[PDB]
Paper text:
MTMRs are part of a large group of tyrosine/dual-specificity phosphatase superfamily (PTP/DUSP) members in eukaryotes. Typically, the active MTMRs catalyze the dephosphorylation of phosphatidylinositol 3-monophosphate (PI(3)P) and/or phosphatidylinositol 3,5-bisphosphate (PI(3,5)P2) to produce PI and PI(5)P, respectively. Most MTMRs possess Pleckstrin homology (PH)-GRAM and coiled-coil (CC) domains in addition to the phosphatase (PTP) domain, and some MTMRs contain extra domains, such as differentially expressed in normal and neoplastic cells (DENN), PH, and FYVE domains. In this study, we determined the crystal structure of the PH-GRAM and active PTP domains of human MTMR1 and investigated its substrate specificity through enzymatic and mutagenesis assays.
Author numbering: 98 to 139, 144 to 160, 171 to 186, 194 to 605
Amino acid sequence: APLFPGESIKAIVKDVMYICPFMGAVSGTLTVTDFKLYFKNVHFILDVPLGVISRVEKIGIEIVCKDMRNLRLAYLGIFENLNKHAFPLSNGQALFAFSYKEKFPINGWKVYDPVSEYKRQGLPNESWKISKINSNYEFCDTYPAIIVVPTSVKDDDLSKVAAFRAKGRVPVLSWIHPESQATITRCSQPLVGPNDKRCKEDEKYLQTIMDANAQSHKLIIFDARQNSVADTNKTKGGGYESESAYPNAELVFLEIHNIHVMRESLRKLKEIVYPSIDEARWLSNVDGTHWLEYIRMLLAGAVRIADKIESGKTSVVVHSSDGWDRTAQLTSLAMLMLDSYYRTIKGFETLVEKEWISFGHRFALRVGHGNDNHADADRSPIFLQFVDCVWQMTRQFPSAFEFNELFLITILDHLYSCLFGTFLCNCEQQRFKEDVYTKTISLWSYINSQLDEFSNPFFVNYENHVLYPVASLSHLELWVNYYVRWN
């Protein structure tokens, strides 16, 4: 079997039967490495990263995968080896990323530089400064080391605001309009609780964010959640900004459902796409998953944010509960609509590095890297669902993005594979602790060393206006190239 630099064979068993869903059963040799399982017949090639493996179960072995397929095998050896190497963090080993020894002409770790990105946006300026208050992750330990905040806020006041926001995730700048100065700041829910606690500093801080947009007379807060779910959160000590505490602000709910319904949705969708589609009942089954309605809700949400910035010329604040699953989906979809830089390949890479990775989407937890707890309720395809949305925009706007569909699918494949450092861990701090930036390779090193493979030939770089995709089921499609890829 073929091997990456740093990859080692763990087992090679001959005469093993792979069971196609339809085309019977092939004979071949099964190699297990610490990176992948490999199966060859002599041509028939099955090449499957152990990262995509969710659970292994004797039936006679069933391999449940995370990329819309299963595998059936007919035979330490096999079971124990797949288990040991598919789930190394459950077995005192490291993820493969840390052994990968390839060297690329381009270093992906240099693609995103926070200070450069802020500078690309016109920052700092008179109203927004680069703050180092979190340079040791002591201020908010799930936030990146660098944040952008209003010039006028004192560090002591920011700390009070942090005590009033879940996990200390205070409002910080995500994007600023280069003409109006309207901004998208992001945060987590305020800790109001059932007795309507108030924090003068929080109220005052939201007010300074508004005053930084000097022409504007109000501030909009998009709360990603359903009204009912925000109310539940309120009884638990969370909640949202009130009309009376935040006088110059107005809050609206985007009604996006919680991470568990998204997991359940994708689960139902896998049932009907693999091993085969029953086309006689395809229409209702797919409808029954509600997968495309949740896509629509998100795109509709992001358009509202985009429209308010671009047309309304009004600064907005996006928050959810912890401000790192739906918040990250919404700010980055709206930024993508607003700023054509992010529709280039390097721009989209900074967008994922910044809004997703540097701000703490819990990738390790949400995806389950190298951990065997398949039933964990903290796993959810939040990032996948986001990439689907992005794919929706490339399809309504087939010349607007520099990257192509294979770019997006390649990202999803390496979301699971752990070949690269890029989607490792749950927050920036964890990444410095675990030596990710020194012991692992960036996904973008690979992608950007082979740009032609991932480029949209139809791309036109002056399609640089705000894009408002149409959030209607009539204008959306099932991403069959990804979801039905395996048959």
